[model samples]
Target: NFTQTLQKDANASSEFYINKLGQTQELEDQQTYKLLAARVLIRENKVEQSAALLRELGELNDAQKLDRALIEARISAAKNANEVAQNQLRALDLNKLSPSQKSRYYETLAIVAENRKDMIEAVKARIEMDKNLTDVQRHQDNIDKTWALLRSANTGVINNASDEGNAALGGWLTLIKAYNDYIRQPVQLSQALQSWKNAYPNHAAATLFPKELLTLLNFQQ
Candidate 1:
């Protein structure tokens, strides 16, 4: 339906465009449509399909080549092709890109690094991302960082690692302490849950904490 809508209603000169590019006759137009299709596919979370479509694109101008590279890197990251994505990203000159493009590049790199469990590199990429993001995006980044820190702590890696004055450290420590208490002293779970809520009152997890904890309790019973 989305593809149909894109084909039919999205373009003002839809007929001319489709007719020109139909059957892959016109190279430029075909490449344009291929990029559009790949974009739509990626937006729909069909990343592997997007990557395949991108692979089919024949030739590109410099700008189009850059676009394809970025899109392919994104799709590779999403598809868990981390090493390929990392190589593609590492080969790019960040200085040649605009701030927004650099942000996107680093964001995709961060995702690839996280998927590869290279948390150190992920954190570094995220820190770079912080410089280019808007105010609201920076706030959202902190929330994401909090979750990442919690995950690292849960894996027992944060305790021995250098904090570097990270604000998320407190939240991670609190969550880990509460989790340990809940596991080691089941009778103190209610108290631990309350402590967790108080510690992260404004965190996204606070909203789901009670419901998830209740589900776990029910499963145990």
Candidate 2:
């Protein structure tokens, strides 16, 4: 339908003056062409292509004609919105997640900042999300190698020397605090969630966290 509509518009207008006021007729017509092309792509469910087209139009047009830019942002944001919603659904279904995953999930939830209309919390959430991602990336290699060796060795020996053992006491304390927070105030729950996410973005126990948490966070605008 969109393809048909674009074709119809093209046929209805002349090469030199399709919906143009005459002076910048050529440029305006070109812009219209680009817009129509983008629309057609969107109708076809080619979201990335549609985003690309809209971005190009925004770049070509002036600030006053930034509707395309807003459209592009909206499209990208829609993708993020879907991700956030999916994460929320998964959290509800699983009912439990690793500290890191819980932290990332909470951080993701905080992405929807409505305070003062400035999206301050959303921005903060994004920064926190990136920090959590960075933390995971930093320690993943060492963690992997350690786990590899542990799995290949004796179970008791592995347990004694595992990083899990080294951090067991502190981890238990953290877990207890996490349970207390979950039982009472939402604030503590959120904080605990963020702490784990910031500390370990990719632990196997934290696997429920979304990979594109930051990408989805960027769509808050």
Candidate 3:
């Protein structure tokens, strides 16, 4: 019960989980305990030890494959093997995953994309993950930070553009900036949404602006 509790609580320090793992060995099934131990190791940033534990587990069932892939992708990215990490994520058939699994997969993909300096891909992945998330409150801060980072990048791109003909790019930048500003100041949400719609009158985002704003409002609350 305590091990499960530790697993569920993100704020639980990994050292506590590790110590609990040692004490609770005979109480839990070995495979389940090992899996939890490996997860705690990864959470603690002991990637190599996590990998070693995973290796000792040998061939995994399909469910375990997803868990292994998540940890492997993290290890690969930590070692700067970005292309390998990307490939590992890209190989997964996302449609076959459970909603939570899909969220985890896309969340990892977002991190990999961010590491690759592909902010657009990172933002898209984050949005995709959000759509599948059941606990938005748990992920709101990370999602907000991702939006902030993408808005900053979009601003840089917009400033560097030499052509006024790039209306699509400009529109996206305007929307992203509006959203970022709203995140920083919830009171400005209505103004931000109105500014985006006014700035890009016929842009596709205008049609979806209300729904997106509603989602942001929930996050802010």
Candidate 4:
């Protein structure tokens, strides 16, 4: 969360702040301490602990309120309360959120949708989240995540391709199916990848291949 202030290290990220947020009652700005704790707890997969910690925040600004809602939605989604999480995320407008906040919102949406086995919705949310991500690893991992969700769908859906009739969804369904169906033969798979790249030049995964796919592409070079 503090990527701007802290590089990844032993304690530079949220795990580092769980301890330092002590004595936070002294400053109004530090009201964010509880929020950080809840985020850390959520990241730790102690949903109930995060849920409990979220209730104790003294006072929060508007951004913190949205953060809490996102965390609550995350907990609800994790608890298999998919509709509750969906409603929470539905209320948060993407236009109002910062890129970081939208990352959480879309990711929470992705989890809730995935929980309900609505693969397209989950992939769409991940696609939305991908727009806000800058890390090369996250971009590549998100590409894999989207591919996984698409692959998880019924074969009927994978082959259907309607997907509410959108370019992005259509492209994902087409490309992943092609990749899976053609992965073994290098020249054939490369053509499939090339065709997709030309079709959706601006797609989130247009250039962000997962390791196996990247390795295959690199093999050609």
**Each prediction's Cα RMSD?**
7.8, 19.0, 7.7, 4.4
Clashing pairs in 2: 100-196, 103-193, 103-194
Q: Ten-residue segment with the worst summed lDDT in candidate 4?
A: 3-12
Model 1 lDDT, full chain set: 0.62
Model 1 RMSD in angstroms? 7.8
Which digits, one per residue and each the tens of the lDDT, describe model 3 over residues 66-157?
Answer: 66676677677766788898888788877666676676677777777777777766666766676676574536544454545455575565
> What does the lDDT come to for candidate 4?
0.73
Could you give me the TM-score of model 4 versus the true structure? 0.78
- Error (Å) of candidate 1 at residue 4 is 26
Candidate 1 worst ten-residue window by lDDT: 1-10
lDDT of each: 0.62, 0.40, 0.62, 0.73
Error of 3 at 81 (Å): 1.3
TM-score of each: 0.56, 0.24, 0.60, 0.78
Residue 104, candidate 2: Cα error in Å is: 31
lDDT of 3: 0.62
Q: Could you tell me which residue pairs clash in candidate 4?
A: none
Q: Candidate 1's residue-wise lDDT over 30-140, tens digit each?
A: 776676666556646777777787888888765557667777788888888898998888777777665655666877887887887766567667656656665554436
Model 3 steric clash pairs: none
- Please name the candidate that would achieve the greatest lDDT relative to the true structure: 4
